[PDB]
Design a protein around this ligand. Sequence first.
Ligand code: HEM
Ligand SMILES: OC[C@H]1O[C@H](O[C@H]2[C@H](O)[C@@H](O)[C@H](OCCCCCC3CCCCC3)O[C@@H]2CO)[C@H](O)[C@@H](O)[C@@H]1O
Ligand SMILES: CCOC(=O)C1=C(COCCN)NC(C)=C(C(=O)OC)[C@H]1c1ccccc1Cl
Ligand SMILES: CCOC(=O)C1=C(COCCN)NC(C)=C(C(=O)OC)[C@H]1c1ccccc1Cl
Length: 463
Amino acid sequence: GKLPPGPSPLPVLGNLLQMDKGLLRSFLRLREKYGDVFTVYLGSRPVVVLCGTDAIREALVDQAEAFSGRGKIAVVDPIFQGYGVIFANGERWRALRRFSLATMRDFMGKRSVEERIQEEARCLVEELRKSKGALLDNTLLFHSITSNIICSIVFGKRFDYKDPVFLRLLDLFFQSFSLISSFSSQVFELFSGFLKYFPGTHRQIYRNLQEINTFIGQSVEKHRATLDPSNPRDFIDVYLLRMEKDKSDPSSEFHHQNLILTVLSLFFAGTETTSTTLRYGFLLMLKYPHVTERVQKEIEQVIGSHRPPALDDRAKMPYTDAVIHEIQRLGDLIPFGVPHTVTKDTQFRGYVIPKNTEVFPVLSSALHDPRYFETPNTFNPGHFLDANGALKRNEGFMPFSLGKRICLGEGIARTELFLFFTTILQNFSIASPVPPEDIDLTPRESGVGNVPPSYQIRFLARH
Ligand code: HEM
Ligand SMILES: OC[C@H]1O[C@H](O[C@H]2[C@H](O)[C@@H](O)[C@H](OCCCCCC3CCCCC3)O[C@@H]2CO)[C@H](O)[C@@H](O)[C@@H]1O
Ligand SMILES: CCOC(=O)C1=C(COCCN)NC(C)=C(C(=O)OC)[C@H]1c1ccccc1Cl
Ligand SMILES: CCOC(=O)C1=C(COCCN)NC(C)=C(C(=O)OC)[C@H]1c1ccccc1Cl
C-alpha cells in the first residue's frame, strides 16, 4: 500500500520464518526481488531497509532531518533510556551532539586528541617490545588502547596496560559486546516485552553496564570535589560547568543522569569498532606481506625511522592512506548500519513511512558496490589510488555512515587508525604461525558487528 514493498509477513513473527545463517544474505536476496528499498517485519514491527549507495544517500542526505531518528536497541535500553549521543532523540540529541562538538573539537585541557593518540602509540610500542616477539592475541591490547583514548578525553587520564582494576572493568565492558551480539540477545531484541521476566543475557548486560556506571559515577564526584572551573581537564569538567550554568533551566538536559550515560555512550561508540578495525587490518597485513612491505617503505620515505608518526604525515602517504580505507571497506564492521527511525511521516520514492518506523541503512551494500569498487570481495588498495598514485574517494566509501547521525568520532577514529598502524609498523614487522595463503578473512560472527576470526601474531622489533 504505502510502505515499501517486501515479503508477506506472518502475524507475530513477521518475516522471521523466511529469514536466516546470515541476515545480510537475506537482505541481499530480498533486494534481488524487491529492489533497493523494501519492508521487512522483524517481529511484529516493520523495518525499512535501504540497500545500495543511492537509496542510502537519498534517505540520509537528501531527506536528512526526516531520517535523523535513532532506533532503540532493547538489550541495552534499560541501562541507557535514550541518554547519550548514540541513543538520544530530538532536542536532547541535538544539544548533546552540539555540546560534544563544541567540546571534543577543543582539546580544555591544553593537550590535543592527536597528541594523546601519539602518546598511547608510544606506550603501545614499549609494551609490545616487552613481548620479545612471542606469539600473542592482540585483542586485549587493541581494546586497551582505544579505551585509553576515551579515558584520556573523558577522565583526563590513561591506564597502564596491566592495571588489574582497569582490566577487570575492561573485561566486563567488552564481554557486554560479545553478549549483545549473541543469539540470545537477538531473540531478546524481538521478544523483550516477554523475555524481560525470564533469566538471560540481558540480565548480565544490565549488571555489567551498571557496574561500569558505578565507576563512572564515582569519577564524576571526584572531578567535582577537585574541580578548577578556570582549568577544565576533560569532558566531565566541561560538562560539570555546563550543569551549573544551566542550573536555572529545567528544560535543560544537562544533568547528572545524562552525564553518566553519555560518558558510557562514548566508550560504547568509541572503542569496539575501532579496536576491531585494527585487529582486522593486522589480519590483512599478515595475509598480504607485500602490502605491509609497501606501507613500511612509505613510512621510511616520508617519516623515517626515528621521529614518531604525526597526522600531517598522512596527506603525504597516499598508499598507507589507501590501505586504511580498504581495511575499513573490506572489513565492513557495521554491515547493516546502526538502526535509524523517521522523525515524522515521510515521503520517499512514492512510499510513505510513518513516523518512528525503523530504518536500516545497509552500509555493506555501499562498501561492496561494483559501481565504486572494481573488485569488491578482494583486498585491493588500488580501490583508493588514481593513475598518478594519489588518493581518491568516491561515494561508495561510507563506513562511518552519512547525514545528521554520521559518526561523531570519525576524525578521531581515522587518527587512531593512522597513528596506531604506522607507529606499530614503523617499529615492528609481523609474523604468524599460519602462512598467508591459509589465512581466512571470513567473519567468525557476521552479525551487527562482523567479527574477524581470532589469530596469533608476533611483533618483531625492527633494526
Ligand atoms: C573505526 C571506527 C568507527 C567507526 C567505523 C564508526 C562508525 C560509526 C557509525 C556507522 C555510526 C552510526 C551512524 C548512524 O547512525 O548512521 C557511528 C556512530 C557514532 N560514532 Fe562512530 N565509529 C567509529 C569510531 C568512533 C569513535 C572513535 C568515536 C568517538 C568516540 C565514535 C563515536 C560515535 C558516536 C558518538 C556515534 C553516534 C552518533 C549519533 O547518533 O549522533 N565512533 N560510528
Ligand atoms: O584505593 C583507590 C583505588 O582506586 C584507584 O583507581 C581508580 C581510578 O582513579 C579511577 O579513574 C577508575 O575509575 C575508572 C572509572 C570508569 C572506568 C571506565 C572504563 C574502563 C575500561 C573500558 C570501559 C570502562 O577506577 C579506579 C578504582 O575505582 C585504583 O583503581 C586502585 O589501584 C585503588 O585501590
Ligand atoms: C534477526 C534479528 O535481527 C534483527 O532483527 C535486529 C534488530 C531487530 O529489532 C527490530 C525492531 N523493530 N534489532 C537489533 C538491535 C539487531 C541487533 O543484533 O543489535 C543487538 C538486529 C540484528 C539482530 C541479530 C542479528 C542481526 C541483526 Cl541486524
Ligand atoms: C546502537 C548502539 O549500539 C552501538 O552503539 C554499537 C556500536 C557503537 O560503536 C560503533 C561505532 N561508532 N558499536 C558496536 C560494535 C555495536 C555492537 O553491537 O557490537 C557488538 C553497536 C551496535 C551497532 C549496530 C547495531 C546495534 C548495536 Cl548494539
